[PDB]
């Protein structure tokens, strides 16, 4: 009777955890933010349009200097943009066209990419020979690679479609830690501002909080009805927002182990592809299959703006470190800077 | 360029040279014929690859026309999360094995194998990304089908079959059952080949079907139809 005994043990343990966290919800976040002054109506103009990709754009990432971009497209190209003068700094040709994610090193010396070849390729940008060369190829995932984030120049964490995440040592070239616990494909990563923890969002309608230096999950967050495609941290690292395929975004509290606010409307039927916050944490920007982005007042949960202008699905979206621009990429092969 | 420094002008012309290289590389890659090779477990696509981990790519050339063939069988993830990457291929090459009308599925002894392949065909044919990509259908192992049909009846797979228990009619029945899974009978088309052997029959059939697909695409995007 070990099987059903452990099954009912886990059932009652989850039930009492749920009851304990339900006896903690004093009042809804909408009840405490019921008197704050609303943001208003956020109106943005396309300052720059970045052209030169000849296929769908699947990923995009900002430099920490708040000026340079990296973008990955399915024409087998990884382009670095100036975004003040719309100049191309580098155009990197990939060995595999099926790139699904790209990342920019926080120092600026490296970019990484990955996709359907189950490999994370790390490129060296500042070489004395004057070209960009593949500095490392991390292999060991048995599924496609869905996200990758640099911790520093020598550490990267990667999500794959084999239901696991992995923290690597770029110098040695082999996994140092493996994070398991998801029952479906892992679709999104977000690093905490201090990179002591990260949050993962998977196809099992679940998110998890992993400690990097321990290799083991701290908390699990449920509440979505479909697959989670995007995830991002609140600017102080005490909350995070997910975007799933049921046309809802949600705000989860790390300390309370609960969700706070749902960002959904009756006129939206398509799933969210991207999620990002503003520098202060008041505006939540979400990219949609609707072909347009939406800006939500992240405290009262009412749409404070719309970013229309893309002819196809919005696949990627980001906000600069200084907080002065929003880059948006889409399946029509154009990026747009907004302000 | 007047309000630009010397170094800004040099950066601008470097960007322009990058643009030139990008256009040169992207016009060359628009002349490649991309084929998405699909199929079920032990369908027979290994022989098909022989005639002509992650994604497996196969470049070849036949009569001054370059073919890319992406075998995607090494991925056990959810197909709905990466299939849209293949929106825009010239055609989908689907391989079926005619010998599976009697074999039961490996994991499930109850569920049939031919019905599983038919389910996969109906899943990919009526998808929302492949509404207008033709499906070149190969029916492999036809020489192991006429041999196994002498002792085994096709009624095991299709209980509603009513006809002669010969190869020439049962093969037509199978082909019709696979072709009738199509819903958009006007938008897209299915090309069926009964493979098994010969010098250059399969490759030339793919060449014919691909040339026809290209002609129809040009007619559609160039006014007519």
């Amino acid at each position, epitope marked *: 009777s070990e099987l059903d005994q452990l099954r009912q043990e886990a059932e009652q343990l989850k039930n009492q955890i749920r009851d304990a966290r339900k006896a903690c919800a004093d009042a809804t976040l909408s009840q405490i933010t019921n008197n704050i002054d609303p943001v208003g109506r956020i109106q943005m103009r396309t300052r720059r349009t970045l052209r030169g990709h000849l296929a769908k754009i699947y990923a995009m990432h900002w430099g920490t200097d708040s000026r340079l971009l990296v973008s990955a497209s399915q024409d087998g190209k990884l382009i670095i943009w100036d975004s003040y003068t719309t100049n191309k700094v580098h155009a990197i040709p990939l060995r595999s066209s099926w790139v699904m994610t790209c990342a920019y090193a926080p120092s600026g010396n490296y970019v990484a990419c990955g996709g359907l070849d189950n490999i994370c390729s790390i490129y060296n940008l500042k070489t004395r020979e004057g070209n960009v060369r593949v500095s490392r190829e991390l292999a060991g995932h048995t599924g496609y690679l869905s996200c990758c984030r640099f911790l520093d120049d020598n550490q990267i964490v990667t999500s794959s479609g084999d239901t696991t995440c992995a923290l690597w040592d770029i110098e040695t070239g082999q996994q140092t830690t493996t994070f398991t616990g998801h029952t479906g494909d892992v679709m999104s990563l977000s690093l905490a501002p201090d990179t002591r923890l990260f949050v993962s969002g998977a196809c099992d309608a679940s998110a998890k909080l992993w400690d990097v230096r321990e290799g083991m999950c701290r908390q699990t967050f449920t509440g979505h009805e479909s697959d989670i495609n995007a995830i991002c941290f609140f600017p102080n690292g005490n909350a995070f927002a997910t975007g799933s395929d049921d046309a809802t975004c949600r705000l989860f509290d790390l300390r309370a182990d609960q969700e706070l606010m749902t960002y959904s409307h009756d006129n939206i039927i398509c799933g969210i592809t991207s999620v990002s916050f503003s520098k202060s944490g008041r505006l939540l920007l979400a990219g949609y299959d609707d072909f347009n982005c939406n800006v939500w007042d992240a405290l009262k949960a009412d749409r404070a703006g719309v970013l229309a202008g893309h002819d196809n699905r919005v696949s990627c979206l980001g906000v600069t470190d200084d907080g002065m621009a929003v880059a948006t990429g889409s399946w029509d092969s154009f990026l747009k800077i907004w302000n | 360029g007047c309000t630009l420094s010397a170094e800004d002008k040099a950066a601008v*012309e*470097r960007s322009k040279m990058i643009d030139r290289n990008l256009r040169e590389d992207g016009e060359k890659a628009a002349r490649e014929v991309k084929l998405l090779l699909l199929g079920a477990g032990e369908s027979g696509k290994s022989t098909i690859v022989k005639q002509m981990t992650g994604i497996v790519e196969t470049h070849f050339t036949f009569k001054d026309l370059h073919f890319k063939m992406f075998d995607v069988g090494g991925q056990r993830s959810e197909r709905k999360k990466w299939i849209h990457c293949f929106e825009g291929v010239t055609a989908i090459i689907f391989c079926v094995a005619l010998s599976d009308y009697d074999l039961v599925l490996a994991e499930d002894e109850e569920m049939n194998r031919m019905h599983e392949s038919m389910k996969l065909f109906d899943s990919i044919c009526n998808n929302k990304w492949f509404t207008d990509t033709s499906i070149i259908l190969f029916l492999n192992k036809k020489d192991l089908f006429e041999e196994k049909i002498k002792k085994s009846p096709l009624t095991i797979c299709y209980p509603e079959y009513a006809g002669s228990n010969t190869y020439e009619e049962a093969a037509a029945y199978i082909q019709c059952q696979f072709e009738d899974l199509n819903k958009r009978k006007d938008t897209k088309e299915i090309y069926t080949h009964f493979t098994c052997a010969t010098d250059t029959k399969n490759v030339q059939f793919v060449f014919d079907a691909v040339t026809d697909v290209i002609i129809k695409n040009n007619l559609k995007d160039c006014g007519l139809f």
Partner: single-chain antibody, 230 residues
């Protein structure tokens, strides 16, 4: 990275000559090239420039009409065709690579040199010598005719160092950015029109001639040079 020049030697006056610089160890086709000469007992003097795709060529207006610059990219070679050589062209021609994108080092590697003997903004370095002792801070000053601080925030000042018998080396680019391979002892500063390079702890590998250059506009002009001897 290696650039080796050739084609020097004694030349009769009024004739012609051709210098070839062969590159090995870097992507030659993505680097602009400059020819920069130096009189036997004088400072550096920019001569010519050819861009990455050969689509932009400049000459100082003292060799214009007599000199031509070209690059063979498949063969990885740079040519200078000199015609009507006067007696004031006796120099040691160096070839220097230059890549311009956002954040690059445009004068990092200098060639080895070609000895040839024939039988705009003004950059001022007031002090022409510094009698200094090791272990103490050193300061050099450079003074520009006009402000180099462009409207985009970039001030285009370069600091090079030439040791006895060696090619010049990029110490600092854009007045504050320390070149890769340079110890943190060197430090550039200043603003707009007056600039200063400071060294904290002098060593025996720092004696030589220091040059300041502007890259605001062509022709690129070099400073007279301050000589640290110890």
């Amino acid at each position: 990275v290696q650039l080796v020049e050739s084609g020097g030697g004694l030349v009769q006056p009024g004739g012609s000559r051709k210098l070839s610089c062969s590159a090995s160890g870097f992507a030659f086709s993505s680097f602009g090239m400059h020819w920069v000469r130096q009189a036997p007992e004088k400072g550096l003097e920019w001569v010519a420039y050819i861009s990455s795709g050969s689509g932009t060529i400049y000459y100082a207006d003292t060799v214009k009409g007599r000199f031509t610059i070209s690059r063979d990219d498949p063969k990885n070679t740079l040519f200078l065709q000199m015609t009507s050589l006067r007696s004031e062209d006796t120099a040691m021609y160096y070839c220097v690579r230059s890549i311009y994108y956002y954040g690059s080092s445009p004068f990092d590697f200098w060639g080895q040199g070609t000895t040839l003997t024939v039988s705009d903004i003004v950059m001022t370095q007031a002090t022409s010598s510094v009698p200094v002792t090791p272990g103490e801070s050193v300061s050099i000053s450079c003074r520009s005719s006009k402000s180099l601080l462009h409207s985009n925030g970039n001030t285009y000042l370069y600091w090079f160092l030439q040791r006895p018998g060696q090619s010049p080396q990029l110490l600092i680019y854009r007045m504050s950015n320390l070149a890769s391979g340079v110890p943190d002892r060197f430090s550039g500063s200043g603003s707009g029109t007056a600039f200063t390079l400071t060294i904290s702890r002098l060593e025996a590998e720092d004696v030589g001639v220091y040059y300041c250059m502007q890259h605001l506009e062509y022709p690129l002009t070099f400073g007279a040079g301050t000589k640290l001897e110890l």
